[PDB]
Design an enzyme around this catalytic site. Structure first.
Site, short mmCIF file in Angstrom:
data_model
loop_
_atom_site.label_atom_id
_atom_site.label_comp_id
_atom_site.label_asym_id
_atom_site.label_seq_id
_atom_site.Cartn_x
_atom_site.Cartn_y
_atom_site.Cartn_z
N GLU A 65 54.01 -8.12 55.84
CA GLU A 65 54.60 -6.95 55.36
C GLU A 65 54.78 -5.47 56.03
O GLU A 65 54.33 -4.54 55.47
CB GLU A 65 53.89 -6.74 54.06
N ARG A 120 50.75 -14.30 57.89
CA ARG A 120 50.18 -13.31 56.81
C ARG A 120 48.77 -13.31 57.14
O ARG A 120 48.26 -11.98 56.79
CB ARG A 120 50.50 -14.19 55.53
N1 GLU Z 1 48.86 -12.42 47.05
C1 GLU Z 1 48.59 -11.09 46.45
C2 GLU Z 1 49.49 -10.04 46.26
C3 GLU Z 1 48.82 -9.18 45.03
C4 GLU Z 1 47.49 -9.91 45.01
O1 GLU Z 1 47.47 -10.66 44.55
O2 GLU Z 1 46.57 -8.71 44.85
C5 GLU Z 1 47.69 -10.32 47.80
O3 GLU Z 1 46.62 -10.95 47.67
O4 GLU Z 1 48.50 -10.05 48.69
ZN ZN Z 2 50.27 -8.93 50.41
#
Ligand code: GLU
Ligand code: ZN
Lengths: 303, 61
Positions: A65, A120
């Site tokens: 991101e 990620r």
């Molecule tokens: N998948 C999530 C996005 C928002 C969240 O769930 O806190 C994260 O862990 O990045």
């Molecule tokens: Zn995220």
């Protein structure tokens, strides 16, 4: 320094050092730990001095991101440029210290810049037998650890890790917060979706401070909207995005940090994580208005 | 119609169905209220299992 481009981790670190050297009485670098691949975890501390409560802000916990790290870096520059001129940031910093971690997952960030643009997770090695690498650092916190929305499969993007705080990046943040002891707001930046959220991701029930956190989130979304017309939706993590056990703001809230919020920045899926570099500055500028609204509310409501 | 959320290794998919529920191949699935993103993208009714479902997915964000 061009704040409207994506930069390497080496470029980011140099700019962090340039900030410190050009504004010594306001900004300092605090190392809070090291990554799996042994890279330093450096936070920028903004302070006017004195023993005071603090706001924690982080970005880049998920490597791909890239608009988050870029936004965090422009934010660092915006605080130092406006301190003493804008009445709001000046009065925020009289009451509170701000701690800003632009790159929460440095190993993942470098891997995403060199090998895999969609990476990620962290880059830690799996204690099995596994042939897969990395843990989701936003499923590794001690808040409903292992529950729905987190996987026990090491090859998954949402793998929680062997135990809470197994990832040194995450343990480094928890240890700093607990040692500090006066952290009063915790804000984390993710991309995409255009959402401003507050606790619970691990369960879909309403938290004790629902009415106040909802009102603060709606005010921040309003302020954000006014610059470029970008609309955000607001609500608890569980109902506005999905269930996600082991997340950071669920941990911070249950630790007693009442103003715990998560942003999903720009876009809604047209570009997704591959946000054009031309949208960095507009995204950072409008996010600043949302951030400032939340910090004003923390300043005005001590606890 | 009932609405569900399915977790997969690389994405999350919601299903809005009538007279069906997600197959076991869709991952870890349980009933769950629809989120904003789900309503926006799950627009078309397609023959699914024993019924019809609307579905859309998003990556972990
Ligand atoms: N998948 C999530 C996005 C928002 C969240 O769930 O806190 C994260 O862990 O990045
Ligand atoms: Zn995220």
């Amino acid at each position: 320094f061009n704040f409207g481009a994506y930069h390497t981790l080496e470029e980011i670190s140099q700019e962090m050092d340039n900030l410190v050297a050009e504004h010594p009485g306001l900004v300092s670098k605090v190392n809070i730990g090291s990554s799996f691949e042994n890279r330093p975890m450096n936070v920028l501390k903004f302070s006017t001095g004195g023993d005071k409560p603090a706001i924690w802000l982080d970005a880049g916990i998920h490597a791909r991101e890239w608009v988050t790290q870029a936004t965090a870096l422009w934010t660092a520059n915006k605080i130092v440029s406006d301190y003493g001129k804008d009445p709001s940031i000046t009065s925020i910093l009289d009451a509170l210290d701000i701690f800003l971690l632009p790159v929460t997952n440095p190993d993942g960030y470098v891997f995403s810049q060199t090998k895999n643009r969609m990476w990620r997770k962290t880059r830690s090695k799996v204690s099995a037998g596994s042939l897969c690498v990395g843990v989701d650092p936003n499923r590794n916190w001690d808040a409903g650890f292992g529950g729905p929305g987190a996987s026990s499969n090491p090859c998954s993007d949402s793998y929680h890790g062997p135990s809470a705080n197994s990832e040194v990046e995450v343990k480094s943040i928890v240890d700093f917060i607990k040692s500090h002891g006066k952290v009063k707001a915790f804000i984390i930046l993710h991309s995409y979706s255009q959402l401003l959220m507050f606790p619970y991701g691990y369960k879909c029930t309403k938290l004790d401070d629902f009415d106040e956190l909802s009102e603060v989130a709606q005010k921040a979304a309003q302020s954000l909207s006014r610059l470029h017309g970008t609309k955000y939706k607001v609500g608890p993590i569980c109902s506005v995005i999905y269930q996600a056990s082991g997340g950071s703001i669920d941990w911070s809230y249950d630790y007693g940090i009442k103003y715990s919020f998560a942003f999903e920045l720009r876009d809604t899926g047209r570009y997704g994580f591959l946000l054009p570099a031309r949208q960095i500055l507009p995204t950072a500028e409008e996010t600043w208005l949302g951030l400032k609204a939340i910090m004003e509310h923390v300043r005005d409501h001590p606890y | 119609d009932e609405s569900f959320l399915c977790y997969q290794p690389d994405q999350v998919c919601c299903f809005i169905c009538r007279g069906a529920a997600p197959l076991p191949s869709e991952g870890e699935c349980n009933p769950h209220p629809t989120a904003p993103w789900c309503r926006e993208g799950a627009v078309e009714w397609v023959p699914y299992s024993t019924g019809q479902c609307r579905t859309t997915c998003i990556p972990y964000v």
